[PDB]
UniProtKB/Swiss-Prot annotation:
The gene is alpha-Man-IIa. One of its GO terms (molecular function) is alpha-mannosidase activity. The keyword Disulfide bond applies. It comes from Drosophila melanogaster. Residues 1-1015 are lumenal. Its cofactor is Zn(2+). Zn(2+) binds at H60, D62, D174, H441. The active site is at D174. It comes from the Eukaryota. It is an enzyme of class 3 (hydrolase). It is a single-pass type II membrane protein. This is Alpha-mannosidase 2.
Length: 1015
């Protein structure tokens, strides 16, 4: 294994280093507005060294943006694909690249057989080429690496099955900035090349100047370079035709033959295209070749990539003709005029890369190495695209919920082969596809029109219901005596209970377990643990009586705590935000202990009075002017008092002190220790009254944030043996700090209401001497060092926080883990901040044509880990990565992949069993089985099950922490006959494994394995 901590990679371009050196001046470069006037030597190209030009036709098709997926499919994409098929069939020389498999699959399945065959033939013959081959072209900022993989696999599995092709070149022209998570996954999925486009205009200028726009992109910790993937960054402002022929868009626009008038398009530079004729072809070619030779100066080989396309292009037959015929006249002239020394033709993306690497092998060029990312993007001036790190945060949180439910459904159902009538494969395919669709760069980003957001939400809701059905059928099969098991595949044996989605105050969607002497004495509940190690976690359920006790399936008592059910109400009469208690529903909380990738059953039983092993929380309501708060049978009366500072400690864990407004002020780790200042504060950013306005994409604050005026908020303290909390009703946020004996959990019920032109931020203020350094993650995969740059505006110092961020000095670290992607930063030493929601009246002029006014209540979740790090073995000051500790990593897992809870729906579960998976290996804590997926249907003689294994890297801080077991995924199911290492999509076998044993992976590595079973 490579050491990912102690060896700083030597690379030609390291993006943090480059950022520190660059000036970011936005000067007028002339016709290339963000560059300079490119010069070339006409003698560079000659009869023995020609410029090879590949014109690559393409059409960018968003799976939802202004229209829904289906609306675009009906109005545009089905015609584009139908006309591509006809035109490429009839014109053997014409080429076209296609990216979005969600659309292609929808189209292909609707084709008659004769046309399916024609389509297969133009792909087989190389005219139509798939690039990337994912279900979508995903966002790279907010997406979790697990879901980027899921959608890539969904599209490529479809392509292998129906087209018989697996792309090895990736095309990502539209995500708003770029992540090294992409080359990481692609390179482990058989890819050899990738292309990107939306990077900061200053970065394009800088790399262009050094001919570093093509580079071998390796991971920031990779000293050897085995993660490296060849990457091509396009040089200009857009991928449209005006910005792809060369530096001068007034010229390139004249070579977009759809812009002459009849298609309702024109050139903003006020010079139109003209149809190519024998009388103008020479002068037109003079102009175009000069653009091409200018572009070619920015690159190292004699092979030039010229994309030819734009959004939803190549729709009309007459459009295919006008582009093809005019380009063909140009090619015939140029290629026959030796003085140009150019050979130009239509080509595909792969053809481009193959010729580039042929030039490389001939010794004509060597490429620089690069590590780092390409956030935060700005396309011009101070317009930084950090708003979409937060836009539509309800659906951002929904993404992470569905992410986990898809994993749990695939894993629970993977243990068995299912009859087709169970509709398991059907429901799993729907769930994967709707989650995969939402990875689109207008889905999770929150940059789609309101009605499209609705469509993505409805699709995800159906996906959640699909996952629940599969999960609950799987639990029933796994925990029922086989000779008793009698499934109705349409029946609901269990319902899922989820405490944090949609979350209390977002939906009264939690079912109460109804017990009573005259109806039902007891209820079975089951917990699933998708992680491959034993896990204990507190779980809660609503019950109809406070007098409930818990047993395990050996009838051993389990310690439990009952608390009231509190709901917060904005009282339009008294103009206060205050909590109400239920007088008929209560919460019971107990510690569940669940095997690795396993299940554990418990029983809740009512009694007529307080049970021996159940305790009751106290409750203290702090406000002036209190009124009574009855709680039915709950055995402890609520107490009242004026607002005051309070301190809490659960178990032997930290002691937390809170201000009289209910906000954290300090954390004391142990009995002896300092009360370390750690202050939560809520603030608001506004919008500029003159100049550019914030919108779905752009964050353009009118200065630093101002504190939210809190008034005198109502504070509720619940103190229990197992769980305590402080909750406060602030304007727009019910803010909750929950303590279970370790790092607290924070929950914010965020309802920005009708506060127009407002962004609500949650800030942590500490005295940690972090200076200008902080760390944020990329796609939940890795943590990258950030440096706050005062030479850039505030919004440029915002980065994606897809799952966590931290600051540290020599002694102390504070880590905030998230259950949803949001934007954030550290705008001053000792600070962390993360945006909660944003409501914007204005559009930001990128084409969406609306502001963001469709906010809805969202429950954001966090864990907050304050730790001593003076003993941790950390990377050197020059290393671009950072790494979590064990506690911070486990805290992240508790948010992203909590225990699943199932409530038995009927009165009696006959043949019920107490546990599944007690014999599963309990793997080392840094190892995860990210995916478990059965790959075969029940009719296959040879069953195959796929596993993705990911090992993170955790800091060595002096904890001996050992005693675990080797996890060999290939032996998890019986009767193994073969074990293969595969690409991460499972589509190609890479290694036939000795003894049928899947080795564990190295820190920061991910591998896939497929086990084959004869049973
Ligand atoms: C699928 O592609 C491979 C590539 O070598 C080819 O050998 C095989 O015959 C193809 N199967 C078909 C034509 O369906
Ligand atoms: C950023 S403009 C971009 C458009 N190019 C469109 O494809 C959609 O993705 C929108 O967000
Ligand atoms: Zn797009």
């Amino acid at each position: 294994c490579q050491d990912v901590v102690q060896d700083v990679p030597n690379v030609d371009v390291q993006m943090l280093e480059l950022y520190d050196r660059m000036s970011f001046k936005d000067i007028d470069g002339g016709v290339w507005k963000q560059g300079w006037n490119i010069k070339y030597d006409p003698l560079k190209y000659n009869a023995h060294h020609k410029l090879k030009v590949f014109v690559v036709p393409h059409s960018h098709n968003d799976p939802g943006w202004i229209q829904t997926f289906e609306e675009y499919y009906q109005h545009d994409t089905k015609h584009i694909l139908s006309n591509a098929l006809r035109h490429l069939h009839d014109n053997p020389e014409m080429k076209f690249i296609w990216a979005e498999i969600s659309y292609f699959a929808r189209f292909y399945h609707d084709l008659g057989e004769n046309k399916k065959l024609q389509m297969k033939s133009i792909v087989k013959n190389g005219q139509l080429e798939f690039v990337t081959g994912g279900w979508v072209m995903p966002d790279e900022a907010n997406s979790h690496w697990r879901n980027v993989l899921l959608q890539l696999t969904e599209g490529q599995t479809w392509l292998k099955q129906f087209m018989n092709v697996t792309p090895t070149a990736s095309w990502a022209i539209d995500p708003f900035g770029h992540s090294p998570t992409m080359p990481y996954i692609l390179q482990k999925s058989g890819f050899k090349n990738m292309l990107i486009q939306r990077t900061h205009y200053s970065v394009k200028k800088e790399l262009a100047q050094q001919r570093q726009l093509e580079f071998l992109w390796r991971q920031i910790w990779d000293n050897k370079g085995d993660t490296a993937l060849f990457t091509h960054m396009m040089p200009f402002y857009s991928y449209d035709i005006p910005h792809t022929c060369g530096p001068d868009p007034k010229v390139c626009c004249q070579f977009d033959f759809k812009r002459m008038g009849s298609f309702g398009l024109s050139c903003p530079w006020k010079v139109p295209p003209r149809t190519i004729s024998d009388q103008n072809v020479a002068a037109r070619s003079d102009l175009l070749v000069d653009q091409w030779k200018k572009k070619a100066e920015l690159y190292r080989t004699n092979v030039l990539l010229i994309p030819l396309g734009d959004d939803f292009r190549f729709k009309q037959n007459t459009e295919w003709d006008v582009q093809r015929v005019n380009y063909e006249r140009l090619f015939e002239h140029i290629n026959s005029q030796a003085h140009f020394n150019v050979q130009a033709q239509f080509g595909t993306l792969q053809e481009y890369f193959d010729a580039v690497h042929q030039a490389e092998r001939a010794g004509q060029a060597e490429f620089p190495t690069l590590s780092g990312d390409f956030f935060t993007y700005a396309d011009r001036s101070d317009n930084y695209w950090s708003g979409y790190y937060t836009s539509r945060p309800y659906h951002k949180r929904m993404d992470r919920v569905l992410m986990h439910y898809v994993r749990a459904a695939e894993m629970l159902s993977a243990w068995h082969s299912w009859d087709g009538m169970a509709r398991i494969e059907e429901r799993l395919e729907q769930a994967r596809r709707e989650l995969s669709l939402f990875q689109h760069h207008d889905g999770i980003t929150g940059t789609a029109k309101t009605h499209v957001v609705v469509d993505y939400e409805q699709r995800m809701q159906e996906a959640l219901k699909a996952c629940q059905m599969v999960m609950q059928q799987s639990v029933y099969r796994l925990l029922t005596k086989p000779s008793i098991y009698s499934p109705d595949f349409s029946f609901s044996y269990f319902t899922l209970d989820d405490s944090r989605w949609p979350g209390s105050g977002v939906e009264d969607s939690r079912t109460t377990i109804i017990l009573g002497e005259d109806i039902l004495p007891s209820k079975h509940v089951v917990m699933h643990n998708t992680l491959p190690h034993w896990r204990e976690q507190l779980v809660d359920f609503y019950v109809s009586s406070p007098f409930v006790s818990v047993t395990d399936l050996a009838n051993n008592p389990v310690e439990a705590q009952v608390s009231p059910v509190w709901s917060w109400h904005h009282d339009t009469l008294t103009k206060t935000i205050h909590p109400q208690g239920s007088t008929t529903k209560y919460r019971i909380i107990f510690k569940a202990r669940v095997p690795p990738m396993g299940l554990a059953t418990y029983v809740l039983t009512i009694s007529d009075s307080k049970p021996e092993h159940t305790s009751y929380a106290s409750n203290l309501l702090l406000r002036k002017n209190p009124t009574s708060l009855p709680l039915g049978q709950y055995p402890e009366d609520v107490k009242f008092g004026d607002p005051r500072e309070i301190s809490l400690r659960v178990g032997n864990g930290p002691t937390l002190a809170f201000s009289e407004q209910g906000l954290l002020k300090s954390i004391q780790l142990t009995q002896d220790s300092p009360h370390v200042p750690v202050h939560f504060k809520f603030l608001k950013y506004g919008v500029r009254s003159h100049g550019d306005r914030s919108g779905a994409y752009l964050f353009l604050p009118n200065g630093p944030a101002s504190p939210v005026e809190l008034g005198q908020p109502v504070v509720l303290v619940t103190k229990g043996k197992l769980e305590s909390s402080v909750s406060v009703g602030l304007p727009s946020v019910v803010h909750q700090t929950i303590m279970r004996g370790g790092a607290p959990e924070i929950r914010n019920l965020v309802d920005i209401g009708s506060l127009d032109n407002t962004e609500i931020v949650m800030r942590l203020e500490t005295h940690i001497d972090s200076g200008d350094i902080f760390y944020t993650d990329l796609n939940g995969l890795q943590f990258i060092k950030r440096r706050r740059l005062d030479k850039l505006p505030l919004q440029a110092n915002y980065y994606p926080i897809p799952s966590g961020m931290f600051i540290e000095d020599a002694n102390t670290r504070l880590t905030l883990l998230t259950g949803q992607p949001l934007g954030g930063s550290s705008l001053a030493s000792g600070e962390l901040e993360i945006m909660q929601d944003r409501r914007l009246a204005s559009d930001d002029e990128r084409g969406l044509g609306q502001g963001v006014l469709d906010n809805k209540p969202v429950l954001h979740i966090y864990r907050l880990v304050l730790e001593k790090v003076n003993n941790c073995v950390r990377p050197s000051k020059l290393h671009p990565a950072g790494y979590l500790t064990s506690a911070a990593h486990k805290a992240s897992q508790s948010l992203l992949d909590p225990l699943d809870k199932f409530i038995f729906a009927e009165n009696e579960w006959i043949g019920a069993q107490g546990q599944f998976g007690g014999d599963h290996p309990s793997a080392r804590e840094d190892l995860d089985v990210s995916v478990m997926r059965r790959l075969t249907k029940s009719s296959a003689k040879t069953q195959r099950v796929g596993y993705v294994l990911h090992r993170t890297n955790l800091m060595q801080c002096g904890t001996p922490e050992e005693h675990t077991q080797k996890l060999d995924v290939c032996h998890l199911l019986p009767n193994v006959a073969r074990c293969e290492r595969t690409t991460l999509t499972f589509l190609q076998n890479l290694e036939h494994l000795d003894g049928m044993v899947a080795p564990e992976v190295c820190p920061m590595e991910t591998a896939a394995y497929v086990s084959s079973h004869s049973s």
